[PDB]
Amino acid sequence: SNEDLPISMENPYKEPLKKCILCGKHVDYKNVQLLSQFVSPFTGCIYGRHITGLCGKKQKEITKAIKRAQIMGFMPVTYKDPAYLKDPKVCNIRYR
Amino acid sequence: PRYELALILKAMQRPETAATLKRTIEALMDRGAIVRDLENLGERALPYRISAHSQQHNRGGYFLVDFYAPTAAVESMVEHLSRDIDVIRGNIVKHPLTQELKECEGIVPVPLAEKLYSTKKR
Amino acid sequence: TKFSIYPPIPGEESSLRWAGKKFEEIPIAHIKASHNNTQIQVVSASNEPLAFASCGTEGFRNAKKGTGIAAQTAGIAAAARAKQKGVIHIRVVVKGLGPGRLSAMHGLIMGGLEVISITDNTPIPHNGCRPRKARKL
Amino acid sequence: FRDDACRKEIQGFLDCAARAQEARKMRSIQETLGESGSLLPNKLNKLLQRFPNKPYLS
Amino acid sequence: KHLKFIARTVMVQEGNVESAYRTLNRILTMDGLIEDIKHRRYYEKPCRRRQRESYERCRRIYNMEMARKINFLMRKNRADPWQGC
Amino acid sequence: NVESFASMLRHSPLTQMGPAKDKLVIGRIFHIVENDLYIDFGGKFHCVCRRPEVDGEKYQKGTRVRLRLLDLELTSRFLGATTDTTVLEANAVLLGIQE
RNA sequence: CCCCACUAUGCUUAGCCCUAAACCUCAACAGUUAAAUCAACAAAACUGCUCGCCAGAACACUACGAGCCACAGCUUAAAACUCAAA
């Protein structure tokens, strides 16, 4: 027929879906260094997904891992471990 | 099933720690567990003070016992660890490596919800 | 170096000092700021009481106790007593969100005590005991 | 209650009171200016009037 | 049971106690502790708590959408290019 | 042998561009209001850019500028709206002049 | 209503009681957005099939009868007198 007519196909310019920083990586309650990245330095509160930036699945995994570590003696509850205060800041929140 | 016993033992000298680990692994074997590995996480100050057997512990030695035990042995092992005096705190979990991580394509965006209210003029 | 809002950690080597004293040795000023009162107790790092002052102990009574003015007066009195006992720098630990939460601190500064750190210790249960029923107003 | 001894503190209190009154007046002026906020509510209402929401079809 | 002078602690910089207290209050507010204490003064019944949470979530949605629209349209606050027509 | 509309669209430079995000285009200023420059870059909608501090006087009507397009049209659907709210202008970053 | 103190009670175990604005007052299943869209408001209008329910207000979550571990109870549930409204 007419060669210049459009053709049905998938979007070639579609950018790959953005992946959470923890996508594809195992979250373990023993990895207190990683879990401490998602808790408040001063109050120990677990940050929300709007702060962490994680997906729902990884947010739930982080939450359950933090609770397990706190109850099993791996992680403090009321504050962030001082040994992990200088770890990379992966949470979108500034207090000062 | 495959379980991982996370164990916090009282900070003791090497002979006492070795004896306690041997006793715990022997108890696991007696209850039927096949111990696969014993991993030492080192001795560290506890995140918070723990009062176990009328004694306040500030430091503890962290170990992991990966094993395969019948479902009925978990309760008995929990009771045994509760009765033990050298164990600050022992918790048996299902082995994290058992649960395979499903592949994630990426964060699928959520479009703004539509047609929640009738388009009649207000 | 750069100033850090995080306190120095016990067991770590820190160059910060106050009159030659480490952060673990600075006395502690506990300010319980209730909704109707403000109590300030100065204690040593080894937990030795040194001074005490509340809005009640300053001659304020009834609703007048739960004011910033009464808390400031209590802070001045407590700071004066602590300075009499040899206290210069203090770590402030405040619990409660009463009217005297901040003004009492000011009183200490007016009394002559330098605040090196401020800590909130307001008791926040993780859903423990059940508080009283809501008022109808 | 002898003012002669207390002159310095009395003057400090008076200066603070005058500063508070002048600062209240300046705060009213600033609110009229609207610099602190991203925009005044009136100008924002004008902007939203220019681009109204359309919860209906036409 | 935890260590002390680690949680909710802010170091004062050159005796600037005002700024230190402001930072501490900002930290408590952002973490939501202040609102939690205020709501825990008197018991909030579960139905009342659910109603408050629903109202606050709807308020958050509306406020975020309004802020997004305001930011989107703010570029159009510039001068009138076709004045007189 | 008359060219069809599909042929024209297929070979049009705008179609050849693909997505407009982070594409360098050449715009022409056609209107100036104080420090606002209204630049037409061949798209459906013009962009509005602030006059740069450097070489501000060098921007006049008919000037050719290098823009980095971010969107051909600024539209967004908001809470409760039935149609996308459009400001009827593009989004581009004014880099400078093209000689 | 406000403040203080305390009890039944809230908790555990073993039985009962079987009621809620038990409401998302919007039944289950399958399907449509075509139009003739559509009283009003609410959370758009519908179609096929089936079950349950409804038939002016009040009397009436009542009386009597019956059933229930319930004995100041719960379920089912009227009628007479009255009004031109609800």
Ligand code: FES
């Ligand atoms: S982004 Fe892949 S699991 Fe969250």
Ligand SMILES: [Mg+2]
């Ligand atoms: Mg009472």
Ligand SMILES: [Mg+2]
């Ligand atoms: Mg209980």
Ligand SMILES: [Mg+2]
């Ligand atoms: Mg209900």
Ligand SMILES: [Mg+2]
């Ligand atoms: Mg009833």
Ligand SMILES: [Mg+2]
């Ligand atoms: Mg009855």
Ligand SMILES: [Mg+2]
């Ligand atoms: Mg009967």
